[PDB]
C-alpha cells in the first residue's frame with residue numbers, strides 16, 4: 257500500500273528480493289576466491305585482485321536492487337547470505353570455471369526476472385534489467401570464457417608456468 | 430502516407446498526440462502551483478521554484494513528443510490545454526499530494542501508451558518511452574512521496590513551523 | 603603447516619575467522635538500516651546514507667581480517683552471514699540504539715580476541731587489533747552515543763519535527 | 776646510571792645489543808646474496824637488486840636499535856658481524872628459502888625480546904617492537920613465501936626458463 261506504488265506486482269517485488277540475495281551470494285563467493293588466491297601457498301595476486309573487484313561489483317549490483325525496490329514502493333526483505341560452495345578453489349582454471357557458472361546462474365535469474373516482469377506487464381522493471389544488468393552479464397561471461405580458453409591453452413591445471421604467465425599478462429597489474 | 434513512415438500505427442500516432450496534451454496539462458498545473466506559492470500570503474519561495482522547475486520539465490516532455498511524432502512521420506494535432514483543477518493549492522502538503530497524483534496520472538498514461546505500442550509491435554516507441562519517460566516518472570514519484578512523508582512528519586497541515594522548515598531545508602535554495 | 607606461519611595459535615586463527623563473520627554480519631545489519639531509511643514512508647536520506655557508509659566500513663573491517671589471516675599463514679574459513687535481527691528499524695532513535703549495541707557487540711568480540719592473543723603471547727595480533735580496530739570502535743561508539751543523546755533531546759520518538767531536524771543538521775548532507 | 780634512564784632493565788639493554796648484531800648479520804647475508812646474483816654466471820639482476828635492497832633495510836633496522844639504545848640511556852656494545860652461512864646461494868629458490876628462514880630467525884628474536892620487555896614491564900620497548908619491527912617481519916615473510924610458491928610453480932630449481940621469467944616479472948625492474 258505504498259503511496260508511490262504503481263504497476264508493481266507482489267511477485268516481482270518478491271523476486272527482486274530473491275535476486276538481491278543472489279547478488280550478495282555472488283559477491284561472497286568472489287570474496288572467497290580473492291582470499292584463496294591471496295594465500296601464501298597460492299600467491300597469484302593479480303588473479304586475487306580480479307576476484308576482489310568482481311566481489312565489489314556484485315555488492316554494487318545488490319545495492320542497486322535495494323534502491324530499485326524502494327523506488328517502486330516495494331519492501332526490502334533480507335535473508336541469510338549463504339557461504340560459498342567451496343572453501344578452496346583449486347587453481348586459476350577451476351576458479352574461473354566456477355566464476356563462469358556463477359555468472360551464468362546470476363544471468364539465468366535475471367532472465368527469469370525479466371520473463372516475470374514481461375508476464376506482469378512491467379516495462380520499467382524490464383528496462384531496468386536490460387539497461388543495468390543483462391549486458392553486464394553477457395560482457396563478464398564473455399571475459400571469463402576468454403580467460404578459460406587461455407588458461408587451457410597455457411596447459412592448466414598441470415602447467416604451473418602457464419598459470420604464472422596468465423597472472424602476469426592476462427589480468428590487470 | 431509520409432515518406433518516412435514505417436511500422437507506425439495510426440492508433441499510436443493518435444495516442445502520442447493525447448500524451449502530448451497531458452504533458453502540457455501537467456506543465457500548466459505545476460505553473461499554477463508556482464504562482465500560488467509565490468503569493469504574498471503564502472510566501473514559500475523554494476517550494477514555488479520547485480514547482481516552476483517541474484512545470485518547465487513537463488514542457489520539455491511535451492516538446493520531445495512533438496519531435497518524436499515528426500520523426501516517425503505522424504502529424505502533431507493540438508487540443509486546448511485545460512486549466513488546472515484548482516485555483517488555489519491550500520498548502521505545501523496539499524500541493525505535493527496533488528503533484529503525486531498528477532505524476533501517477535501521467536505515468537499511467539505512459540504505461541498505457543507502452544501497452545499500445547507493445548500490442549502494435551512498435552519496439553522503437555517502446556524504447557522511447559522506456560529510455561526517455563518511464564524512469565523519470567518513477568524517480569519523480571519517489572521524490573514527491575518522500576516529500577509528503579516529511580511534510581506529515583513535520584506536522585502539516587497544522588504546523589506552520591514545520592512547513593517553514595521544509596521550505597528552508599528540503600527543497601533547493 | 604604454512605611456510606610463513608610463526609607464533610600463530612590455532613585458537614587465534616579460528617577466532618579471527620569468527621571475528622570476520624561478525625564484521626560481515628555488522629555490515630549487513632547496517633545495509634538493512636540504509637534500506638529502511640531510504641523507504642518512501644521513512645525518507646530520511648542523510649540518516650540512510652550514514653548507515654550505508656557504516657555498512658561499507660564494516661566490509662572494509664572484514665576484508666582486513668581476510669588479509670591478516672593470510673599474512674599470518676592462517677586459512678580463511680567462511681560461514682553464512684546471518685540476516686539482521688529486524689526487518690524494519692522503527693525510527694532514527696531505535697536504529698541508533700541498535701547501532702550502538704551492534705558496535706559494542708563488535709567491540710566486545712575484539713576485546714575478547716585481544717585477550718586470547720595476550721593469553722597466547724601473540725604481540726603482532728595484539729598490535730593489529732589495537733592499531734586497526736579498537737580505537738575505531740571507541741570513536742564510533744562515542745559518535746553514536748552523542749547522536750542518541752541529541753535524538754532524545756529532540757523529543758524522539760514522538761517528535762517528528764525533531765527527527766527531521768536531526769537528519770538535516772546532525773548527519774552529513 | 777644514565778640521567779635519562781627510567782624503567783629500562785639491564786637484561787633488555789643487553790638483548791637490544793644482541794638484536795642489533797642480528798640485524799647487522801641479516802644485512803650482511805643479504806649483501807652476499809646480492810653479490811651472488813650479480814655474478815656473470817648467475818646474472819639475475821632484478822633478483823640481485825631485491826637482495827641489495829633487503830640488505831640496506833636490515834642496516835636501517837640496526838641503526839634504529841642504536842638510536843633506541845641511546846634514547847633509553849643504554850649503551851651500544853658491538854660485536855663482530857659474522858660472515859654469512861654460505862659463500863654461494865645456488866639459485867633463486869635456494870636463496871629465497873634462506874631469506875625466509877633468516878627473516879623468521881630475526882622475527883623469533885624480536886618476539887623473544889618482546890617477551891623479555893613484557894616480563895620486565897617495559898611498555899615503551901613493547902611499543903617500539905610492535906610499531907617498528909613486528910609488522911615489517913610479517914610482511915616480508917609473507918612476500919618471500921609468496922615468491923617461493925611462485926618459484927616452485929615455475930619449476931625451480933630445474934626449470935631455467937621459469938627462473939628467468941621470475942626475475943623478469945616478479946621482482947622490481
Ligand SMILES: [Cl-]
Pocket residue numbers: 261262263264265
Ligand atoms: Cl501496484
Ligand SMILES: [Cl-]
Pocket residue numbers: 269270271273274333
Ligand atoms: Cl520477499
Ligand SMILES: [Cl-]
Pocket residue numbers: 341342354
Ligand atoms: Cl563450486
Ligand SMILES: [Cl-]
Pocket residue numbers: 341342343344
Ligand atoms: Cl572445498
Ligand SMILES: [Cl-]
Pocket residue numbers: 357358359361
Ligand atoms: Cl553457480
Ligand SMILES: [Cl-]
Pocket residue numbers: 271368369370372
Ligand atoms: Cl523470477
Ligand SMILES: [Cl-]
Pocket residue numbers: 386387388389390391392393
Ligand atoms: Cl547492463
Ligand SMILES: [Cl-]
Pocket residue numbers: 395
Ligand atoms: Cl564489450
Ligand SMILES: [Cl-]
Pocket residue numbers: 402403406426
Ligand atoms: Cl583474454
Ligand SMILES: [Cl-]
Pocket residue numbers: 434435436437438
Ligand atoms: Cl506505417
Ligand SMILES: [Cl-]
Pocket residue numbers: 442443444446447506
Ligand atoms: Cl490525434
Ligand SMILES: [Cl-]
Pocket residue numbers: 514515527
Ligand atoms: Cl486537484
Ligand SMILES: [Cl-]
Pocket residue numbers: 514515516517
Ligand atoms: Cl480552487
Ligand SMILES: [Cl-]
Pocket residue numbers: 530531532534
Ligand atoms: Cl491527476
Ligand SMILES: [Cl-]
Pocket residue numbers: 444541542543545
Ligand atoms: Cl494509449
Ligand SMILES: [Cl-]
Pocket residue numbers: 559560561562563564565566
Ligand atoms: Cl526516463
